[PDB]
Chains A and B, each alone.
Chain A
């Protein structure tokens, strides 16, 4: 039972566990891997996840969600003031630490945002535990890259309230890069652009990865751009339509609008795989059955500026990172809203047709990375490296035929693998343009008595007297015994290779 990582968002969250080289992303009670960052305080119990989201229209005044905007902030913080004007619940200046007042079991208790998010984390904890069949406290929680230190501590504390051992707080874009394997090494010295288009926010972050070591070069964003306003444009389409079609002003009924919005969310998600989606609500407003539709093209028109504006922070991030388009090697998507074809088309066209990394569901990639990181942090073994080195060795020395018909070993018998070993060779005779390397396995001095594994030619060698050209021959062996023998001439940079397949007295006298 491995450590887990939790993707703690403003509108949604997701938990995964890392094991057997992969992260298993875990479904909630209804089969949903990603569930809402909502807690509904009712007079009987607090519902968490889909259960809270499903009743926002009925109990919005007591349902608390998007705790993150308030977490780690002071009551007087302009952000706090900006968001409290948008909530159905009351935000309270309890010592400049904004609390939310909702009725729980009949009492108008003020709940601090860290406990609201711990309620969410506790639910995510329970989801992963039910799946894994084991209680789990070892965890990584992700946060936006822009979070400051009061916010990071606040996130750790929400974890502690929930009973978690917070191994670490890591950034959302780091986790995505991890999820896509950009930290597996051999992919170093690359720039990664992460496009984080979520529910209530949009962020862009440019990372540089050097063989597993990360640096963040730049960030940019729009703190109010995300799926929620794509939903609001779809809502205005349907709300104004309803009113005009029926001469009934639905916009004034918070529940009817929320039912319409829920349909907007469903239709929009459907629309992203489709070309068309519909709205079908019985008795939506004043007993009126509202049946209508949205096409993909209409959706894009409604939201045409919301989509185009996502590239403005892209240009900003590139400016801050001092990078041109050509300097981004890896294009990465984060957030369910990037599943809309228009987003993919805009980012991909912006970067001249280059393919986006869509290999992991955008809403799972962050949790995925957190889970991988949680597993290494709980104890630093992650399908490597010491077992590979101690269990698998080169069973026979590995080397090459050299002049004289003899074998020169570069990898010694029973040496641990994976490993890379080298030696310097020159052409045997004078003024040759290249060399012939015969790769062998075995313990005999002569090559005629060894196992020929394969042969290759190293070209690009300036002719010079014997012993002058400097050729480095490398025996590069992986964990499974596969051998790659390469060679290069250090004076020209030219190289070639062969792939070898796997087997698996006087002093006592006087005068």
Chain B
């Protein structure tokens, strides 16, 4: 046995340095989706709508308070709102990429005129073009656009309400106030704030007229095998759950402005 010692004489004190070490680099961008066809978007729109509604779920959950909504209602809202979110998403890209003449299904896919006017396309796409045309006529900013996309998310609910509706209502009203702010700080003057606000709001309200017709296409092609239209599992579940309620008037269209 030997006298002990403070060995090795190599015991570090990195404590002040460990307090210093904190930073790391974080990155943006989490997922991606495109269609793989043009006139055949008559079936690929559903594959895209599937991926876009799923993205819309991730996006919706990312908005504070959405995940605290009952799941049954979170899914009900995407089940009914996916159609306006899709048409509106096309709207923004169309507005900026083709001066709202063509629909832009993904940043990498624009369907041109030679396919755009075919009935398999146009019977549904003309309503999506209405939306693109209005964002362009209205000269919507990206902030104003996002406020509206966010508003559309909670715009279509059952006539009987939502299980956790009180939180949905607080979230939806926060969103409309945000649209107002996006406009007030951009147009200037007073008369232009209310005109830009109400004109953009009229698009949110008219999105329901767009949805009535776009959904009727999907409902009809979902049930009538004569149409030969394929759906992804996501929309197939949404559409079987949505048809008996939407076409029968059991779904309420929420408007943010009066006519």
Contact = CB atoms under 8 A, between A and B. Distances in A.
Contact of B3 (A402, A424, A487): A402
Interface in A403-446: 403-404, 408, 423-429, 432-438
Contact of A403 (B1, B4, B10): B4
Nearest to B8: A467
B3 A436 contact: yes
B1 A459 contact: yes
B3 A401 contact: yes
Nearest to B2: A432
A425 B6 contact: yes
Contacts of B2: 403, 427-429, 432, 434-436
A400 interface: yes
Interface in A178-202: none
A441 to B, nearest CB: 18
B1 A402 contact: no
Contacts of A423: 6
A459 B1 CA distance: 8
A400 B3 CA distance: 10
A400 B4 contact: yes
Contact of A438 (B1, B3, B8): B3
A8 to B, nearest CB: 50
Nearest to A426: B7
A423 B4 CA distance: 11
Contacts of B7: 425-426, 428, 466-467
Q: Chain B, interface size: which category?
A: 10 to 19
B5 interface: yes
A436 B5 contact: no
A267 interface: no
A300 interface: no
Interface string A435-478: 11110000000000000000001110100001100010100000
Contacts of A471: 4
A403 B4 CA distance: 6
Contacts of A437: 3-4
A401 B6 CA distance: 11
A438 B4 CA distance: 9
Nearest to A457: B1
A436 B11 CA distance: 22
B8 A435 contact: no
Contacts of A436: 1-4
A287 to B, nearest CB: 87
Contacts of A402: 3-6
A360 to B, nearest CB: 46
Nearest to B1: A434
Contacts of A487: 4
Contact of B1 (A435, A466, A473): A435
A433 B1 contact: yes
Nearest to A427: B2
Contacts of B10: 467
A466 B6 CA distance: 10
A409 to B, nearest CB: 12
Contacts of B5: 402-404, 425-428, 466
Contacts of B1: 432-436, 457-459, 461
A382 to B, nearest CB: 37
B3 A426 contact: no
Contacts of A433: 1
A397 to B, nearest CB: 16
The residue among B6, B8, B10, B11 with the most chain A CB atoms within 10 A of its own CB is B6
Nearest to A433: B1
Contacts of A435: 1-4
Nearest to B9: A467
A195 B132 CA distance: 84
A428 B4 contact: yes
Contacts of A428: 2-5, 7
Nearest to B10: A467
A498 to B, nearest CB: 14
Nearest to A473: B4
Nearest to A471: B4
A307 B7 CA distance: 65
A408 B1 CA distance: 19
Nearest to B7: A467
B196 to A, nearest CB: 63
Interface string B37-69: 000000000000000000000000000000000
B4 A425 contact: yes
Contacts of A461: 1
B3 A408 contact: no
Contacts of A467: 7-8, 10
Contacts of A458: 1, 4
A426 B5 CA distance: 6
Contacts of A429: 2
Please indicate which of the listed interface residues B5, B6, B10 has the most CB atoms of chain A within 10 Å of its own CB. B5
Contacts of B6: 402, 408, 423, 425
Nearest to A404: B5
B258 to A, nearest CB: 57
Nearest to A487: B4
B6 to A, nearest CB: 6
Interface string B1-38: 11111111011000000000000000000000000000
Given A402-B5, A432-B2, 7 more contacts: A402-B3, A423-B6, A428-B4, A436-B1, A436-B4, A437-B3, A459-B1
28 contacts: A400-B4, A402-B6, A403-B2, A403-B4, A403-B5, A423-B6, A425-B7, A426-B4, A426-B8, A427-B2, A427-B5, A428-B5, A428-B7, A433-B1, A435-B4, A436-B2, A436-B3, A437-B4, A438-B3, A457-B1, A458-B1, A461-B1, A466-B7, A466-B8, A467-B8, A471-B4, A473-B4, A487-B4
Interface of A: 400-404, 408, 423-429, 432-438, 457-459, 461, 466-467, 471, 473, 487
| Pairs A-B, 5 closest by C-beta atoms | A434-B1, A467-B8, A467-B7, A428-B5, A425-B4
